[PDB]
Tab-separated table of N, CA and C in Angstrom:
chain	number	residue	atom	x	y	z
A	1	UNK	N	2.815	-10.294	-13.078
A	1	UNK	CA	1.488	-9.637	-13.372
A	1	UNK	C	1.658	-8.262	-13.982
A	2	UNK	N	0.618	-7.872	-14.999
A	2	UNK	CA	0.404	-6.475	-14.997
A	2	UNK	C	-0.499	-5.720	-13.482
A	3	UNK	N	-1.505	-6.048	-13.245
A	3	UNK	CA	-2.109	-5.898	-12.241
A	3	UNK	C	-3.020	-6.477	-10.884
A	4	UNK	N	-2.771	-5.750	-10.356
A	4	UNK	CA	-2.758	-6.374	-8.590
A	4	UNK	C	-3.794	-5.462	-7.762
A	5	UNK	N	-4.835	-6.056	-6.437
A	5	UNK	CA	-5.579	-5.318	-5.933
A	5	UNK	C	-5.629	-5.716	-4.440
A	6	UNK	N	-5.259	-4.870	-3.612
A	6	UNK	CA	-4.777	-5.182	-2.427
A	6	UNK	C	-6.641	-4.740	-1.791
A	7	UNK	N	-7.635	-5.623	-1.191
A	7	UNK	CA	-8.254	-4.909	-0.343
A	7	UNK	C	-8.241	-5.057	1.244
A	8	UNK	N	-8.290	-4.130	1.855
A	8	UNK	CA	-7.720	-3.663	3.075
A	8	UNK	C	-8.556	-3.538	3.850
A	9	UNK	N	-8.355	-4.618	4.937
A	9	UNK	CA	-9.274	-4.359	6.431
A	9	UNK	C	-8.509	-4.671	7.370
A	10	UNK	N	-9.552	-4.311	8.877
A	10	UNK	CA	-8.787	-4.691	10.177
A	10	UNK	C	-9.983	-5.045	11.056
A	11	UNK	N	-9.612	-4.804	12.397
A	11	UNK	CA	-10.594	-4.834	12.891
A	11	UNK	C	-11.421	-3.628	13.434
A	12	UNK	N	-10.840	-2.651	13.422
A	12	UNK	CA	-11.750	-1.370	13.523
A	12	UNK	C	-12.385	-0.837	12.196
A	13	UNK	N	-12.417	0.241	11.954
A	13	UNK	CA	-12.894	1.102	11.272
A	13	UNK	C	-12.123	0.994	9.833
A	14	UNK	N	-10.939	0.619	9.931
A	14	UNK	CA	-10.046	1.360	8.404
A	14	UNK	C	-10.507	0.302	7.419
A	15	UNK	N	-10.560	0.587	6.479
A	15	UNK	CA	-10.847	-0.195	5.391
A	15	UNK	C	-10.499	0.727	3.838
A	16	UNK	N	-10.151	-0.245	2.358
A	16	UNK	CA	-10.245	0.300	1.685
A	16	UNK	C	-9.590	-0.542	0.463
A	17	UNK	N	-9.124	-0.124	-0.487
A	17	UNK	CA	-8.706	-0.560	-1.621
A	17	UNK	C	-7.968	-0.129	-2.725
A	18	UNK	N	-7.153	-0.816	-2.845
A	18	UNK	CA	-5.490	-0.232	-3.529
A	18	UNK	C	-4.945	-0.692	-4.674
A	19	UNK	N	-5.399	-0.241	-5.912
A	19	UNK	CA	-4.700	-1.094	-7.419
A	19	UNK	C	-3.397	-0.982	-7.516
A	20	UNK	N	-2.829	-1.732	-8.212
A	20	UNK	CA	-1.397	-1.381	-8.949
A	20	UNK	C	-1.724	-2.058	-10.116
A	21	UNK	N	-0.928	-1.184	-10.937
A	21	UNK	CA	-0.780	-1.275	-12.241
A	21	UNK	C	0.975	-1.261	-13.076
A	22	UNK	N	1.151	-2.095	-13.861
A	22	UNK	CA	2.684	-2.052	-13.908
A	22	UNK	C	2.599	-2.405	-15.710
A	23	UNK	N	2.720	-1.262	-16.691
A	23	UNK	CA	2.671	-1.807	-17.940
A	23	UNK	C	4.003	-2.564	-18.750
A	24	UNK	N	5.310	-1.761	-18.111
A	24	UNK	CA	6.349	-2.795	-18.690
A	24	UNK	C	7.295	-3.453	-17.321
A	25	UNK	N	7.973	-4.076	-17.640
A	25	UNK	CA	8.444	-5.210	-16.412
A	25	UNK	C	9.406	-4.241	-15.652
A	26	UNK	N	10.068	-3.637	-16.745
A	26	UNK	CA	11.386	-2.802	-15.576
A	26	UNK	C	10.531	-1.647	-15.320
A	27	UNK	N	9.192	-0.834	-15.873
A	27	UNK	CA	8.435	0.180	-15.443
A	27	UNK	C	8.110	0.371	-14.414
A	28	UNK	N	7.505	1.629	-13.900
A	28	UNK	CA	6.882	1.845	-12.698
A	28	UNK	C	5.650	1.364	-12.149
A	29	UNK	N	5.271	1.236	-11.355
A	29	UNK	CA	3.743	0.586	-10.869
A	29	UNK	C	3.142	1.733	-10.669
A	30	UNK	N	1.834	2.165	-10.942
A	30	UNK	CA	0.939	3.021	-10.805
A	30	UNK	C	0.068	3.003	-9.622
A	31	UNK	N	0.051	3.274	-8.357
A	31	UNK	CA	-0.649	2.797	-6.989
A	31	UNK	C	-1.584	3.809	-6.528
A	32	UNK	N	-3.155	3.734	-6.598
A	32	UNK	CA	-3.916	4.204	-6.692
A	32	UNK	C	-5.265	3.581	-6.265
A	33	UNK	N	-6.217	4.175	-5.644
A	33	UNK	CA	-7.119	4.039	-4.661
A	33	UNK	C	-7.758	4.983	-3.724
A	34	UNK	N	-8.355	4.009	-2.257
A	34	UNK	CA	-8.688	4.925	-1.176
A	34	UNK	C	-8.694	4.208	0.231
A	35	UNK	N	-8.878	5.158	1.331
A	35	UNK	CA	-8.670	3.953	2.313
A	35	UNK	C	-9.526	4.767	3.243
A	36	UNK	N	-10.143	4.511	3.760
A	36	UNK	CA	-11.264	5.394	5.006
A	36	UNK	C	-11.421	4.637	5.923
A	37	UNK	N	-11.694	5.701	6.809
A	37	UNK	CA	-12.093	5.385	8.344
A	37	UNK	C	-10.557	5.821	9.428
A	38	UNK	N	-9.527	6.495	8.678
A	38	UNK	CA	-8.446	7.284	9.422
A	38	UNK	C	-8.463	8.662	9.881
A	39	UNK	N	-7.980	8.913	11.236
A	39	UNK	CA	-7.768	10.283	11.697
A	39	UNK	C	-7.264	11.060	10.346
A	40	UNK	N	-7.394	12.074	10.595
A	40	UNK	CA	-6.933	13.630	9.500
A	40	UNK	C	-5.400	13.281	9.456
A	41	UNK	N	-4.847	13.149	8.449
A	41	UNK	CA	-3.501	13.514	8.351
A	41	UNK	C	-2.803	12.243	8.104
A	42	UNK	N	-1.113	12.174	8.108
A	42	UNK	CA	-0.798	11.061	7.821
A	42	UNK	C	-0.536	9.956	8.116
A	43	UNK	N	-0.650	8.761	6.845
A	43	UNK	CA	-0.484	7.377	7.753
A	43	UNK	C	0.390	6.886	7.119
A	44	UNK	N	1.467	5.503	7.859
A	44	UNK	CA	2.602	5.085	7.170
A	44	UNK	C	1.820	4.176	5.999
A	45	UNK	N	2.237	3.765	5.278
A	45	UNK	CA	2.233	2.941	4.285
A	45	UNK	C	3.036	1.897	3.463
A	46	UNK	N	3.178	0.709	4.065
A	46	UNK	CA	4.176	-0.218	3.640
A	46	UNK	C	3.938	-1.620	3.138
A	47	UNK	N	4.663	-2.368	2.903
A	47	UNK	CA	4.107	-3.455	2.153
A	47	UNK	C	5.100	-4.178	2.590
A	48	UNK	N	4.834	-5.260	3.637
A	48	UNK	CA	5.680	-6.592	4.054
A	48	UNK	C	5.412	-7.575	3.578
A	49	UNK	N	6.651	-8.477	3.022
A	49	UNK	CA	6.583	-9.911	2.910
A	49	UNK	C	6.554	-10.625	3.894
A	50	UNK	N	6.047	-11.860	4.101
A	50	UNK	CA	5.560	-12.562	5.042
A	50	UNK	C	6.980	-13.334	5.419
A	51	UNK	N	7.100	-13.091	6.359
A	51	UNK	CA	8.763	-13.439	7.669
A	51	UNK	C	9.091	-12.550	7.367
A	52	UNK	N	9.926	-12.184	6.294
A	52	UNK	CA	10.822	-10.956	5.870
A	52	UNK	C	10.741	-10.026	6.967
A	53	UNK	N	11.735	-9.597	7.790
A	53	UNK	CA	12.163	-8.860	8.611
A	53	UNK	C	12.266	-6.968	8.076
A	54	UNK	N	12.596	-7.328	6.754
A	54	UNK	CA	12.261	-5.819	5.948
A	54	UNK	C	10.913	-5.559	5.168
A	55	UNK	N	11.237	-4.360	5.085
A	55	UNK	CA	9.571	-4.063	4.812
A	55	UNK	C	10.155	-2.840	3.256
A	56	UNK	N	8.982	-2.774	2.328
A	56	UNK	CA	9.159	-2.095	1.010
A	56	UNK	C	8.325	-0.330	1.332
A	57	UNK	N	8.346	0.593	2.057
A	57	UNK	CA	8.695	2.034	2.080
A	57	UNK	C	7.521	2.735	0.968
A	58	UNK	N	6.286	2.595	0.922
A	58	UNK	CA	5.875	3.646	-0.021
A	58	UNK	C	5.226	4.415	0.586
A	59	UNK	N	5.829	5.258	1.780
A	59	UNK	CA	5.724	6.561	2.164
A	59	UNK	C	4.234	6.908	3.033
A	60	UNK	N	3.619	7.865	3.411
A	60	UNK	CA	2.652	8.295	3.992
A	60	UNK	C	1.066	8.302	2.837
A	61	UNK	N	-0.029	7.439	3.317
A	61	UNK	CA	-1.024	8.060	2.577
A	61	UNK	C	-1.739	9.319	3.334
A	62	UNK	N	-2.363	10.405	2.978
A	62	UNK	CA	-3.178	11.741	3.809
A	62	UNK	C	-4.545	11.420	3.972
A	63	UNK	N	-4.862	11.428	4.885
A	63	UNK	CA	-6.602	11.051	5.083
A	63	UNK	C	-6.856	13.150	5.033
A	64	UNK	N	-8.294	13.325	4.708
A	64	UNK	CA	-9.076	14.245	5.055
A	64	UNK	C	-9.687	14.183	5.823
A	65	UNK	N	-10.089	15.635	6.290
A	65	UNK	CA	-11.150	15.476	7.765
A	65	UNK	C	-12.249	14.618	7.793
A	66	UNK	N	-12.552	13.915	7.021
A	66	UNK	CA	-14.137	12.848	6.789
A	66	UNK	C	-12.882	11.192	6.875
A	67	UNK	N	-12.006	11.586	7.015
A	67	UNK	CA	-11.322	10.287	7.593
A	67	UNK	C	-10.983	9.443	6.230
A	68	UNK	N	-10.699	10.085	5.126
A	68	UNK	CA	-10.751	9.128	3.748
A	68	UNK	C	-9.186	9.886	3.271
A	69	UNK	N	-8.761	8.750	2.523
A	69	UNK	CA	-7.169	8.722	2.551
A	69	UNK	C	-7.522	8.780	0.518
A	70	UNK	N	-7.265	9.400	-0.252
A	70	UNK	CA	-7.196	9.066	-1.536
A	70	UNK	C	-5.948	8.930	-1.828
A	71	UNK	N	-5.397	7.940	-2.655
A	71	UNK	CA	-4.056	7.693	-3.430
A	71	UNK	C	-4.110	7.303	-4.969
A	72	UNK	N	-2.673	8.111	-4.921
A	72	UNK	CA	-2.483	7.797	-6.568
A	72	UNK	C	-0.739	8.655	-6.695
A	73	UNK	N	-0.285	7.358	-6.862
A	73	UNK	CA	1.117	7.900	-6.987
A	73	UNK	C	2.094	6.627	-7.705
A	74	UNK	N	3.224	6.944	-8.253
A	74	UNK	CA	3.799	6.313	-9.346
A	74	UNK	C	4.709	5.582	-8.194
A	75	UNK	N	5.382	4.449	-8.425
A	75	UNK	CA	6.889	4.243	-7.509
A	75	UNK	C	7.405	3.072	-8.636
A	76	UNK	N	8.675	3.636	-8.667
A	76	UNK	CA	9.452	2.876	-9.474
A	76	UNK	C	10.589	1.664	-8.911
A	77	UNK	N	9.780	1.557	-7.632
A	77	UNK	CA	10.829	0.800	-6.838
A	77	UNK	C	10.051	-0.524	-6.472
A	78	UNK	N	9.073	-0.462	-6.340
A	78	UNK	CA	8.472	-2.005	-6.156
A	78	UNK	C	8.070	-2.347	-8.161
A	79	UNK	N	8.163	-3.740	-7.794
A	79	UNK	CA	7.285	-4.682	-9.289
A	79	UNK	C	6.070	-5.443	-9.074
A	80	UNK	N	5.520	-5.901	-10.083
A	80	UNK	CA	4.544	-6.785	-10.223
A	80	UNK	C	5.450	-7.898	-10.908
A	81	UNK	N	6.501	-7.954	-11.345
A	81	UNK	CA	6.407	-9.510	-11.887
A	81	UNK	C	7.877	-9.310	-11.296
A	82	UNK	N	9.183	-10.462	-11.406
A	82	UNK	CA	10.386	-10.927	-11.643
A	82	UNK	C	10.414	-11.427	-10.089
A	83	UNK	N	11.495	-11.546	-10.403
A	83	UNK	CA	12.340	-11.601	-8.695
A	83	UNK	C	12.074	-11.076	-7.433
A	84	UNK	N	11.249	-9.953	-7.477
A	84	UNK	CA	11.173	-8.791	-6.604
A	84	UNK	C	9.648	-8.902	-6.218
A	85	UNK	N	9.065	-9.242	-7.125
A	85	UNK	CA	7.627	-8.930	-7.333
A	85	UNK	C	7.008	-8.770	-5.732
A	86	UNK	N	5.906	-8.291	-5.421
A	86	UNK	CA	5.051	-7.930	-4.225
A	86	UNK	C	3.707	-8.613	-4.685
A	87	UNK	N	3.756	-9.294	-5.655
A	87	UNK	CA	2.253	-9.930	-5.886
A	87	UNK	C	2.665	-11.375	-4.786
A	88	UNK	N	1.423	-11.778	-3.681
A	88	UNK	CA	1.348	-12.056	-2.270
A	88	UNK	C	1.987	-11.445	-1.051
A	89	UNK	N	2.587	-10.451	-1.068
A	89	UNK	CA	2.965	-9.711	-0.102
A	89	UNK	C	1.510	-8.641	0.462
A	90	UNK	N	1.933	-8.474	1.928
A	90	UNK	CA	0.687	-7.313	2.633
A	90	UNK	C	0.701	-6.402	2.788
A	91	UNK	N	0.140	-5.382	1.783
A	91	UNK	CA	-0.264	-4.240	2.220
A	91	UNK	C	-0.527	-3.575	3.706
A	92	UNK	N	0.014	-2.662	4.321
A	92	UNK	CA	0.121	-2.319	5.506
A	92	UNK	C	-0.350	-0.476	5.722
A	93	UNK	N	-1.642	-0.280	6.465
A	93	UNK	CA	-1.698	0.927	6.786
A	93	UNK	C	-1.756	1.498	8.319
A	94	UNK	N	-0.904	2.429	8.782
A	94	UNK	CA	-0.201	2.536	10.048
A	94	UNK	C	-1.146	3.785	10.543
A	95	UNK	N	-0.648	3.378	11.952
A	95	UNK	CA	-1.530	4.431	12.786
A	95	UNK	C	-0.757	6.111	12.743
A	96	UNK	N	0.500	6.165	12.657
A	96	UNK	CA	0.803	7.133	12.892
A	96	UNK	C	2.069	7.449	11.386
A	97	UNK	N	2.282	8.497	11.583
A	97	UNK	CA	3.083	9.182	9.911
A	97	UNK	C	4.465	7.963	10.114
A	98	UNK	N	4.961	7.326	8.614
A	98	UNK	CA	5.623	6.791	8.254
A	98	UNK	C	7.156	7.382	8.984
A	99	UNK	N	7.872	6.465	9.901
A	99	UNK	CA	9.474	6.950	10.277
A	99	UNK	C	10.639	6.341	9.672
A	100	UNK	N	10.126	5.723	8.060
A	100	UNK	CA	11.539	5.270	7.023
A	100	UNK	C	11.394	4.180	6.601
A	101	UNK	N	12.084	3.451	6.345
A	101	UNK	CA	12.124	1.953	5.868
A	101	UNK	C	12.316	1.284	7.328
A	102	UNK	N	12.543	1.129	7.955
A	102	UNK	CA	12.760	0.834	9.569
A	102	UNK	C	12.244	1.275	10.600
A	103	UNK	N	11.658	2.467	10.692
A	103	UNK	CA	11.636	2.726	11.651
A	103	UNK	C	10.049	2.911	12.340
A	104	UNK	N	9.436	3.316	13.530
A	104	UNK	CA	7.902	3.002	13.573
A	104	UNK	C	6.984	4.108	13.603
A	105	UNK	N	6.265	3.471	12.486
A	105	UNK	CA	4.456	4.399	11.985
A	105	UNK	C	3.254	3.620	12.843
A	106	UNK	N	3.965	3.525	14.361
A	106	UNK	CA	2.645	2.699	15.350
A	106	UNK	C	2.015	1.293	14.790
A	107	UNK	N	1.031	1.002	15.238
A	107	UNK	CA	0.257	-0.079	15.413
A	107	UNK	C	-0.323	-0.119	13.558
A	108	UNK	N	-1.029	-1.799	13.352
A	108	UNK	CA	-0.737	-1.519	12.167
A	108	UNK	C	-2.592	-1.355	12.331
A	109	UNK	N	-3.107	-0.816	11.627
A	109	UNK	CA	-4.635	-0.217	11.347
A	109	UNK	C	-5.520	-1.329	10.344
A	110	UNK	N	-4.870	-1.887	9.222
A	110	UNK	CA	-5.569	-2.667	8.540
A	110	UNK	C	-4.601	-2.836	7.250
A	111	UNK	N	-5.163	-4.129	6.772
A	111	UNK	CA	-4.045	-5.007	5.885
A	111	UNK	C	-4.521	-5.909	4.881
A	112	UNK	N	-4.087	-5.909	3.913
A	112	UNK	CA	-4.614	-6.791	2.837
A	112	UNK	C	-3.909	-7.461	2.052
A	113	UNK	N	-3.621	-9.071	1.476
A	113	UNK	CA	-2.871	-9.484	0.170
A	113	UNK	C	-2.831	-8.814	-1.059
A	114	UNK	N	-1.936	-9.000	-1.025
A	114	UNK	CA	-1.684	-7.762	-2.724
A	114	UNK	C	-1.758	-9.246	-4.024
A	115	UNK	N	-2.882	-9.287	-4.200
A	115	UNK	CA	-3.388	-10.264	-5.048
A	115	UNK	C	-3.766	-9.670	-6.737
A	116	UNK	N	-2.925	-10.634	-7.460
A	116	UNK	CA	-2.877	-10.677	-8.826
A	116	UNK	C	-4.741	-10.671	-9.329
A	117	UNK	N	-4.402	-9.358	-10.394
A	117	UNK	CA	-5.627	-9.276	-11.183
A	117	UNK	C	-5.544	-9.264	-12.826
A	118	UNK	N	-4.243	-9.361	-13.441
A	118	UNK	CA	-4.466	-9.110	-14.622
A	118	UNK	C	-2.973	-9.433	-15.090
């Protein structure tokens, strides 16, 4: 794919919605959106394949005091198309600040398929 739209719920409060955009194959994905209904400050942010025991690392999103998380940031480490791709993999937003590729950002808050748009 060029582009993908993850939308994100749970069962509480968090909710929201997350594009990627990827214009050439070995390029970066463009990941951008919002996610509300989170405490002030940061949340992990990851993207698991389904069994896969590892998880893909794109760092903390920041909520503001009105509980709304805005994103927009480049990563050159996940794809939309080849071998690697994350198009059907789940978007993951965590209760507490991101502790690595391994390690734990709490309970997970709300989650969505990262489903092909373009």
């Amino acid at each position: 794919a060029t582009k993908a739209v993850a939308v994100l719920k749970g069962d509480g409060p968090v909710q929201g919605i997350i594009n990627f955009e990827q214009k050439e194959s070995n390029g970066p994905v463009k990941v951008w959106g919002s996610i509300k209904g989170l405490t002030e400050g940061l949340h992990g942010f990851h993207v698991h394949e389904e069994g896969a025991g590892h998880v893909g690392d794109l760092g903390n999103v920041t909520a503001d005091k009105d509980g709304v998380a805005d994103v927009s940031i480049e990563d050159s480490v996940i794809s939309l198309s080849g071998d690697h791709s994350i198009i059907g993999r789940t978007l993951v937003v965590h209760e507490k600040a991101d502790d690595g590729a391994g390690g734990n950002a709490g309970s997970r808050l709300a989650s969505g398929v990262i489903g092909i748009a373009q």
